[PDB]
Each structure stands twice: as C-alpha cells, then as structure tokens.
Design a binder for this molecule. Structure first.
Ligand SMILES: Nc1nc2c(ncn2CCN(/C=C/P(=O)(O)O)CCOCP(=O)(O)O)c(=O)[nH]1
Ligand SMILES: Nc1nc2c(ncn2CCN(/C=C/P(=O)(O)O)CCOCP(=O)(O)O)c(=O)[nH]1
Ligand SMILES: Nc1nc2c(ncn2CCN(/C=C/P(=O)(O)O)CCOCP(=O)(O)O)c(=O)[nH]1
Ligand SMILES: Nc1nc2c(ncn2CCN(/C=C/P(=O)(O)O)CCOCP(=O)(O)O)c(=O)[nH]1
Ligand SMILES: [Mg+2]
Ligand SMILES: [Mg+2]
Ligand SMILES: [Mg+2]
Ligand SMILES: [Mg+2]
Ligand SMILES: [Mg+2]
Ligand SMILES: [Mg+2]
Ligand SMILES: [Mg+2]
Lengths: 203, 204, 200, 198
C-alpha cells in the first residue's frame, strides 16, 4: 500500500475545501480525498485480478467502513460494466461496537461464498479477530479483507489485510467516515484533529 | 414538490444504449432511471435539505440495505455544500435495517431531542416507513424528516408523503442503485426493470 | 445506432426539479437532457469507440467551442478504459464559425481521426469539416456527435457515434451556446424565447 | 498563496500504487501529482476565483492545448458553486493558442472579468506578453495549475501547485504531443523520453 511516513506533515487546511463547521477543529489534512479515490481505483483492479472468477459477497463493516465500501464497490462496478472481466456482487452490512456484534444475526448468505470484508482501518487488529471468529461460524468458501488504512502500531498482533489503501503512522485520524465520538464522519478528507477539536467534541 | 414524475407509460431505455454489467445483460429488460439522472436529482435534493434543515445538526439515518447508495450520494452532495458555503449542516450518521424485523435498533435511544433525516430507497405500501416512524417517535426526537429516492404511485392504506422525493414512479418492480430482487441487482448503478429470465434465474 | 431518441412530444423536465444557475432561472423552458444522462450516454459511446478503434492510435479532434465538454468527458471515459489491459491518444482542436470560417492540421496526416462535435443540424458544418480534414490525408476518419437534430432541412449527416437524436428545437447547455451564453450550464435545455431576448 | 508546495526532493509515487494507462507502462517513472490531488486543489481554487471575480461577468480564457483539462475541471467546480448558492454571475468562454492564435475579438474582453487559465508557468515570459496585451478589461487574473521554481518573476493570481524545475507530463501536459491522455502528473522514464523523442 501507500506508505505514509512518521514525519509526514500533511497539508494546510487553507489549500483545500473543508466543511465550514470543522474549520477550527482540524489541524492538517492528512490524506486528501482525491488521493483516497485514486488509490481505491487501483485497489478495485487488484480486487478484480484476485477474486475475478467468482461471485462475491461484499461485507461492509459499519460505521466507518461505509465510505470506502461504497466507493470501492463503485470502482468495481465500473470494471464490471466496461471490461471483459467480471465479479457479480451481493452486499451485507455488519457492525462491531467487550465487542458486541450487530446484524449477524443474518449471515447464512456467507455460507459457501466468496467473502470480501471491507474495513476502514486496522489498528490493534482485535476488531478483525472478532469478525473472523464470527465469519468462521458460517463456513465461507473464501475470505479476503480490504482495509483503507493500516496503522503502524506496536500494539498490533501482526494481522495484515489482503488489500491495503495506506499504511499510516500511529496517530489518531478522522474523516472519510472515520469518527471521533461520532463527529467528523461527514468529512471527505482524512485529517488530524486540532486541540480545540478534541476539547469541543470530547465525550 | 412530489419529485420527478415518471409516467405510467414510460418505456425506459434500450439496454444497448447504456453501459451495464455483462453478468446482468440477459437479466434486465430496460434501463428505467439512468444513474446520472439519479445523481442530478439527488444534487437538487441536497440543496432542498440544506434549505429546510440548514444551520442545524442532523442525524442522518440510513435504512439498509437498499438505502445505502442514495444515502452515500445524498450525504456527499450535502458535504459539497458544507465545504463550499458558510451555511453548514453538521451531520452524524446511523444505520438501521428493516426486513417485520428491525436490526440495529438500539441507537434509537440516542435520537432523543435530535433532528433526524431518515433516508430510504423506496416507498411502496408505506408500511415499512410507518413502522419506522413510530419506532423513532417513541424516543422523542426534536424533529423527523424523511427522504425517499422513489415513491410508487400505488394505493396506500395511509396517505403518507415523505418530505423529500427523488422520483415518483409507476407501480412497477424496479432494481438497481442498491434496490434488489432477492439480493441480486444491488451491484448496478441504473434503476431498471427486470427481464422474465431475470425473475426466473434469481427466484428464491 | 441512431442513439437515444428523444421524441417530438417529449415534455422534458421542470427546471425546479434540478440545480440550475440562478442567472438562467427565467430564461429556460425545460431541461431536455440532464447532465447525468449525458454522462451515462457518453460512457457507452466511449466503449463503442474503444470497440471500433481500439488497439490503434487516435487523434481526437475537438470542434470548438461547443464540442469542448463532450470532448473532455468522452476522452475521460476512454482514458478510464485505457487503464485496463488501449487506445493511445493525441488531441487537437479546431473552430468553425459562420460563409463558414476556420480557426496546424498536419498532425492528422496518416492518422486515425475521431472528430468530436456537439451537434449536427443541417450538416453544413460537418461537410465543410470533412472536406478540409480529408485534405490533410488521414488514414481513417470517424465522427462522434453528442446530438443530431431531426430536421427536414437535411443533407444531413449520419455520424458514426451519436449520443442523442433530438427534435427540431434550439437547445443550449453542456457547452452549446446562445450568443456565447449558456455554455456554463451543465444540463442541455430548451432556451426560452423571452430568454433569447435577454442575451444579444 | 504559493499553492501546494511540492519540494525538490519529492520522490513521488511508485506506478504500481495507481491505475496508469497500459500503453504508458514503461514510459513513466513516478506518479508526481495524483489526479485526485489535482481535483481537490482545483475545487479550492474554484472557490478562490469566485471570491475574487464572482462579482461581475467572467470571461474564462483557455490556453490550448495543455490548459484544456485544468480549464474544464476548474469551470465545472465554478459552475457547481454558481448553481448551489442563490448568488451567481454568467460566465462565457474562449480558447487561444500561444505562438496569440484564434480567440474571439479581444474587444469581447472589455468591461469583463477576464480569467486566463494555463497549465504551467515556467519562466513566465509567455503570460507577461499575453497580459501586456489583453489589457481595458474590468479585471484580469491568471490561474495556473503548476508554477515552477530561472523565472522572470511573474506569479499568477491562483496557483495549483508549486513544483521543482523538473520536466512533467500528464493532465494534458505533453512531451511531443504524447502523455496528454494521462490523468496524473508524472515524470517520464528514459525509455519514454527516447521512444517519443522528437
Ligand atoms: N477514527 C479513528 N478510529 C480509530 C483509529 N485507530 C483505531 N480506531 C478505532 C477503531 N476500532 C478499533 C480498531 P482495532 O484494529 O484496534 O480493533 C474499530 C471500531 O470502530 C467502530 P466505527 O467504524 O467507528 O463504527 C483512528 O486512527 N481513527
Ligand atoms: N427492489 C425493490 N423492492 C421493492 C419494490 N417495492 C417494494 N419493495 C420491497 C421493499 N420493502 C417494502 C417497502 P413498503 O413501503 O411496501 O413497506 C422494504 C425492503 O427493504 C429491505 P432491503 O432494502 O432490500 O434490505 C421495488 O419496486 N423494488
Ligand atoms: N446551441 C445550438 N446551436 C445549434 C442548434 N442547432 C443548430 N445549431 C448551430 C450549430 N452550428 C452549425 C451546425 P450545422 O449542422 O447546421 O452546420 C455550428 C456551431 O457553431 C460553433 P460553436 O460551437 O458555437 O463555437 C441548437 O439546437 N443549439
Ligand atoms: N509539458 C511541459 N511543458 C513545459 C514544462 N516546463 C515548461 N514547459 C513549457 C511550456 N511552454 C511555456 C512555458 P514559459 O516558460 O514561457 O512560461 C508553452 C508550451 O505549450 C504549448 P501546448 O500547451 O503543449 O499546446 C513542463 O515541466 N512540462
Ligand atoms: Mg472499522
Ligand atoms: Mg469509532
Ligand atoms: Mg428500503
Ligand atoms: Mg429488498
Ligand atoms: Mg459544433
Ligand atoms: Mg453557437
Ligand atoms: Mg501552457
């Protein structure tokens, strides 16, 4: 994936269009929306090259997964209608919130199927451990994992997704559906929160 | 406005004039609402939402599964206004699924005293919507509004009208733009009507 | 093949259902082809061009000014296809204005040329253009026009690629003008007669 | 604003991290500025243009050929601004090539807010000539996607990116007419430079 370095300074907010209501709440733009798009376009092709023979169930991990999920699937849809290659897709949504699971339940749709799990970020890798444990209970034919972000953290068990958008430093990022206490999901760029932001939006 | 009126005698478009996924080439009969028309209409709807809810925080409630495409696009159009004006609608997002079984039901307590925009793919009998409204109302939100991409002209037992409507359509079964037939056709950008071979292939 | 056919009795859409620049609000009658529909049609056209001319080098020739939007989007869709397993492209621009006047075409020589136009009406412009272009000796010439107007005032011209076939009404938007106005409008619309009076 | 500053030591991106035109696979070395970044910056530039020029009728002048992509995208963002706030002004367009080749009469620029749209400013001699010609418009401003750091000291009013003294192609910028059909700003490889050599 795209490696973002520890000393990556990001961009000044005044160079980009940002939501009026978060103008004072962000410190820098970390990953511009357009960069996320470009990288996701390539990821869609990588997904096709890998899982292209088969019908796939795309499993969206809510809430933060929703933007990456819709965009990735859209790029995949563009391939399906303009190429000879093909991945017929059905979709499913799951939420993990010590980790409670909502919406599976459900989920025999996964049995004997090719599963593409779609996540916003891998940090400790624990959420993903909980998910795979539940997916195992339905006996899928194949499981692949795509994550927009993978965080470089010593708190990691060492788990790595098949498809990675960006490998990022051990910093807390928001935007592109990633939240701080449910705020900042309504933001297209991945960014870092300012001092004012932390205090204003703290729980 | 009651949205864009698609006539009862609308023929739709020959599949050959559009790019459609090859795996559905035999399973569809006509494109009924082109993806791009949906986007154009959704852009206007975001501006309508901004005019009616602007300068206020909203909880945007996505009704899975079929609502997910309209939800993402509408929110993207709203975000475009948010970052290009000094008028702004700060938004938080939530998800719910109705299947009548309700899934994801315990973030509904959090709606108390809030402004809620429910986002749906379609209103047919209206029973899903009425069920969902009464559920939200149990938690006393300050305000509830409903946006629905499609509303069918069909007899309804109550005369409910959503606040924002993309298109008013004939009483025909449509698929695409996340609307399904037995989970198929969600991976299709256009709204379409299904062929007889489509109905048979994917019949549950 | 004759493209998306828009009927003579087509009502179009009420302006109030779309986002439209305020400065054109009272000057338009209806929306005829929503920007997004233009996009969806142009995506298929890209694939049609890739099917006909694929695997070979192409000069894409933009006919200014009205052709510029269709040209940009059509090429963007072709480039999208090119990022998958290819039509290498160079580009050029030409303007014809009406006696029809022209505004170096040596590039075209021995190449496969795709002329990109906004609209064919009488077909005069296109005969004028093909006449000149063929004098620079290209290997092949194909013509894409977003719009072709159904008219008794015919030569006419059948382009190889056609977006929409429309009624004999004066349209503006998506870079087509009325007296240089309305190019900054993303939808194709029918101009009002009261609208025509406002832009001289 | 000097725009988004791209340093001299900016390495850019490995080609395999992005979707690249198949036919340019060996002809490029690095992605230098991703298309998505260009779009993000252009969106902001659009709002900057409207903040300054949106008070009166704008004539947008496209400098062919390399300016065509930037021009199209910039105006679409401007059109988006103009159709989502109840305040707007008409905008007309023209096209020129710099030898000045083939726009409308320059008297169409009188009394208007003229916006010149360029792909790149290097020395800046070209623009200085055009500017010292275009002049009684109500106002003239220049938007350029790229500005290089042997200049004669001209700076445009709106800058997308400030780049090193490197030769770049893509987003309609060419090497001998090639590479215009490329969405990213990139750097040519040795293979590329000699394959399309003049
Ligand atoms: N917004 C944000 N959230 C972060 C980040 N790192 C971990 N998290 C917490 C995400 N959580 C932990 C990931 P791990 O691999 O350690 O199990 C996942 C669950 O988040 C639920 P939701 O998407 O917010 O509804 C971060 O950099 N930004
Ligand atoms: N794809 C499609 N589905 C249709 C249609 N009409 C009803 N439905 C079924 C949707 N249902 C009924 C709406 P009502 O107002 O009658 O209570 C709700 C379906 O939601 C389940 P999901 O979005 O497929 O996960 C239709 O035209 N197309
Ligand atoms: N905007 C607009 N223009 C129309 C229309 N019909 C003919 N025209 C005239 C186009 N003209 C001739 C077409 P024909 O096949 O009859 O030779 C050429 C347009 O002029 C060049 P530009 O693109 O406006 O700079 C129309 O419906 N809308
Ligand atoms: N493609 C490319 N071209 C570069 C570059 N630097 C200068 N140029 C030369 C561009 N030239 C002017 C530079 P000045 O110093 O006078 O401000 C103009 C050439 O443009 C002709 P066209 O757009 O290809 O039709 C570069 O990095 N890439
Ligand atoms: Mg997650
Ligand atoms: Mg979280
Ligand atoms: Mg629904
Ligand atoms: Mg359903
Ligand atoms: Mg023309
Ligand atoms: Mg004209
Ligand atoms: Mg130039």
């Amino acid at each position: 994936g795209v490696v973002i370095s520890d000393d990556e300074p990001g961009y000044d907010l005044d160079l980009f269009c940002i939501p009026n209501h978060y103008a004072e709440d962000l410190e820098r733009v970390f990953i511009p929306h357009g960069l996320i798009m470009d990288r996701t376009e390539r990821l869609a092709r990588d997904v096709m090259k890998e899982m292209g023979g088969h019908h796939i169930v795309a499993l969206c991990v809510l809430k933060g997964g929703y933007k990456f999920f819709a965009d990735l699937l859209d790029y995949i849809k563009a391939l399906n209608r303009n190429s000879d290659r093909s991945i017929p897709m059905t979709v499913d949504f799951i939420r993990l919130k010590d980790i409670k699971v909502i919406g599976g339940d459900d989920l025999s749709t996964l049995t004997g199927k090719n599963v593409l799990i779609v996540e916003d970020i891998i940090d400790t890798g624990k959420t993903m451990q909980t998910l795979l444990s539940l997916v195992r209970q339905y006996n899928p034919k194949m499981v692949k994992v795509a994550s927009l972000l993978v965080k470089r953290t010593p708190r990691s068990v060492g788990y790595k997704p098949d498809f990675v958008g960006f490998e990022i430093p051990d910093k807390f990022v928001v935007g592109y559906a990633l939240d701080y206490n449910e705020y900042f999901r309504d933001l297209n760029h991945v960014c870092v929160i300012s001092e004012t932001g932390k205090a204003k939006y703290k729980a």
